[PDB]
């Protein structure tokens, strides 16, 4: 009954694959031949934000699409005004090895986390005026690789112990755990409708999770190697995974399978970060050839490049109004592009 | 308006104070040398950072260790907290001057695992430039094991029989030369890794350490000095 049900799960995995092949009625590139191509997008380093001492490994834009937060492994979490090129705040982190930072939608809070296995929440609009840590979310054992605020009181944090978790900042405990992943969870993106989130891991799998039920809604395994970063399509009915096999992939939620691949023969290094434009026509992907290529997400064509760094591009973000991109990198300097 | 120009002047004042703090911590950051500690549990990385500590480290996550010899700040990171897979959080330690990689030399069934780990460190694309200060630990236990017999390197390494010691030391291996044949052979098994890869972007620095020793910090000092000097000579060839 044990090996019998493992065999049944094997034929169940095979019938899921074959049912996806039956439900793959028409591909995306088949119908888009009538579409005019997006043309050559050329984008320029509008701002160049200097003032990190070590490699920048994460950034998050603000919801007002002007402020941003950058995380770098010298120990500084810095809030930057992109318009003025003025560092609004600088934060000395308790442990410098951080891999993620999240900006709250209200803007009152900022998050960080890394190899010290605690998700630190700093309050910005504070009573005294000096920003300080408001909460230290402990309970994950692996390194924290992505965190995202839902609100001022709910944050999802991915981790290197293969489990995502939904946390209450006020109590300080994990409201929900998400333990389905086999490999180290390297990213997460919450939906525009915020009812659900997808997270990718090193097991080449991206899993869709419902935040209220807390169960694995869906799993996608179309990649070959470690999924480094993930991002929903802005409609919320698809997402793009950037993985270390030098390919990006688009997965639709209701199709429950892969749509297209975003890769070229020349590009052989890994995606470190991936993001979407406001319409979602341009898929943006940072890389380890020190650049940031942008694809027609509908046509799968390498339609531009953002070469401004001489180390790898770790983090990639797009404003909510779409007016800017912020590519941080390991060369300690972040850049605003349009 | 006038108030908006006053507020952007306040933004410039805040930016000036932030930038002054950033330079004031930049000087400290560039003065301090970061080091990554790797190894296994049987390999005495704990006692080695104990002699660096005795001559505020938290268990949760990173274990940090701070020391200085000859007024040079060394800050070295034992990762005691993460999981057993390390293909991703090892990318954080890419701006590190030198990796200290501690090997239990007296356990020959874990030596091949240690060699594979060293090979991964040497050939990692984000570790292609970091020198590895190799610390072949527990040379008391290796000497006692080889002198005791009943456990042979040819059991776990067939090419030990075709080995002789090219260069050695008199006082430390002065009890018996056969253990010298042991203690250099393992060393060559790392250097065979350390030579075949790359056009000299980084250098291994092997060392022989017993259970308790004193000159670990001095060895880290001199090997970091040689690696940073080699970096600056490659910059003199370039800058």
């Amino acid at each position, epitope marked *: 009954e044990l090996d019998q049900l493992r065999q049944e799960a094997e034929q169940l*995995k095979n019938q899921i694959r074959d049912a996806r092949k039956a439900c793959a009625d028409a591909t995306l590139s088949q119908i888009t031949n009538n579409i005019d191509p997006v043309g050559r997008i050329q984008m320029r380093t509008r701002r160049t934000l200097r003032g990190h001492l070590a490699k920048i490994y994460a950034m998050h834009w603000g919801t007002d699409s002007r402020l941003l937060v950058s995380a770098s492994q010298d120990g500084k979490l810095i809030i930057w005004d992109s318009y003025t090129t003025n560092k609004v705040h600088a934060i000395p982190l308790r442990s410098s090895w951080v891999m993620t930072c999240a900006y709250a939608p209200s803007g009152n809070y900022v998050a960080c986390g890394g190899l010290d296995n605690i998700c630190s929440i700093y309050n910005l609009k504070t009573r005294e005026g000096n920003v300080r840590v408001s909460r230290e979310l402990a309970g994950h054992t692996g390194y924290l690789s992505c965190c995202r605020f839902l609100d001022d009181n709910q944050i999802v944090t991915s981790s290197g112990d293969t489990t995502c978790a939904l946390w209450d900042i006020e109590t300080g405990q994990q409201t929900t755990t998400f333990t389905g992943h086999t490999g180290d969870v390297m990213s997460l993106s919450l939906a525009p409708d915020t009812r659900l989130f997808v997270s990718g891991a090193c097991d*080449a799998s991206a899993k869709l999770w419902d935040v209220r039920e807390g169960m694995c809604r869906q799993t996608f395994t179309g990649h070959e190697s470690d999924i480094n970063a993930i991002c929903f399509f802005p409609n919320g009915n698809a997402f793009a995974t950037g993985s270390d096999d030098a390919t990006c992939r688009l997965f639709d939620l209701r199709a429950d399978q892969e749509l297209m691949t975003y890769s070229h023969d020349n590009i052989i290094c890994g995606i470190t970060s991936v993001s979407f434009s406001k319409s979602g026509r341009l898929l943006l992907a940072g890389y380890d050839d020190f650049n940031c290529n942008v694809w027609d997400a509908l046509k799968a064509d390498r339609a531009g490049v953002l070469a401004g760094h001489d180390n790898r591009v770790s983090c990639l973000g797009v404003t909510d109004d779409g007016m800017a991109v912020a590519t941080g990198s390991w060369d300690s300097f972040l850049k605003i592009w349009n | 308006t006038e108030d908006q120009r006053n507020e952007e002047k306040a933004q410039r004042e805040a930016n000036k104070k932030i930038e002054k703090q950033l330079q004031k911590d930049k000087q400290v950051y560039r003065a301090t040398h970061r080091l990554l500690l790797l190894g296994a549990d049987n390999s005495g990385k704990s006692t080695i950072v104990k002699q660096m500590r005795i001559l505020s480290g938290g268990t949760s996550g990173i274990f940090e260790t701070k020391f200085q010899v000859d007024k040079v700040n060394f800050h070295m990171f034992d990762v005691g907290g993460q999981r057993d897979e390390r293909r991703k959080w090892i990318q954080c330690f890419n701006d590190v001057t030198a990796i200290i990689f501690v090997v239990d030399s007296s356990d020959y069934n874990r030596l091949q695992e240690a060699l594979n780990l060293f090979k991964s460190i040497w050939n990692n694309r984000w570790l292609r430039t970091i020198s590895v200060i190799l610390f072949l630990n527990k040379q008391d236990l290796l000497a006692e094991k080889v002198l005791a017999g009943k456990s042979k390197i040819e059991d*776990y390494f*067939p090419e030990f029989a075709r080995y002789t010691t090219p260069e050695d030391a008199t006082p430390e291996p002065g009890e018996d030369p056969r253990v010298t044949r042991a203690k250099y052979f393992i060393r060559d098994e790392f250097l065979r890794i350390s030579t075949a890869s790359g056009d000299g972007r980084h250098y291994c620095y092997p060392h022989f350490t017993c259970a308790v020793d004193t000159e670990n910090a001095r060895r880290i000092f001199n090997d970091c000095r040689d690696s940073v000097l080699a970096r600056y000579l490659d910059e003199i060839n370039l800058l």
Partner: nanobody, 126 residues
Framework: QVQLQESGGGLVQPGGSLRLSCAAS????????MNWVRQAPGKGLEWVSD????????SYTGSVKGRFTISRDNAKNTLYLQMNSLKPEDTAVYYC?????????????????????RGQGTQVTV
């Protein structure tokens, strides 16, 4: 899905041979450096052998250096371990394992509890 299915295995005498096989699915086989790992009973996972992307660089752990030999068929997407001269300490569960990244020389396959890109494993015994 990245799926590695083992084959071969089964009973063999204490001087016998088995050709352990691993078929690969869901990735370009030529891009990845391949490994053979064994889980001994009462022991942790330990690396046995590996082969480069082109089949040029081949290495073995020292207990099996002369005895075993590996070959990889990129046409058939299959990793082969010819196992000669079995001992009772050669009896273990045998996993093929591809290295986590492509186009790379570094590998982090043999882990303590789990690794994503191992096969299911076929047991070999005395």
């Amino acid at each position: 899905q990245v799926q590695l299915q083992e084959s071969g295995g089964g009973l063999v005498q204490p001087g016998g041979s088995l050709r352990l096989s691993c078929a690969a699915s869901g990735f370009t086989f030529s891009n990845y450096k391949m490994n053979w790992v064994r889980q001994a009973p009462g022991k942790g996972l330990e690396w046995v052998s590996d082969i480069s992307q082109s089949g040029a660089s081949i290495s073995y752990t020292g207990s099996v250096k002369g005895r075993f030999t590996i070959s990889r068929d990129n046409a058939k997407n299959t990793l082969y371990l010819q196992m000669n001269s079995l001992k009772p300490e050669d009896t273990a569960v045998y996993y093929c394992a591809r290295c986590p990244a492509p186009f790379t020389r570094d590998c982090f396959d043999v882990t303590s509890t789990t690794y994503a890109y191992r096969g299911q494993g076929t047991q070999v015994t005395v």
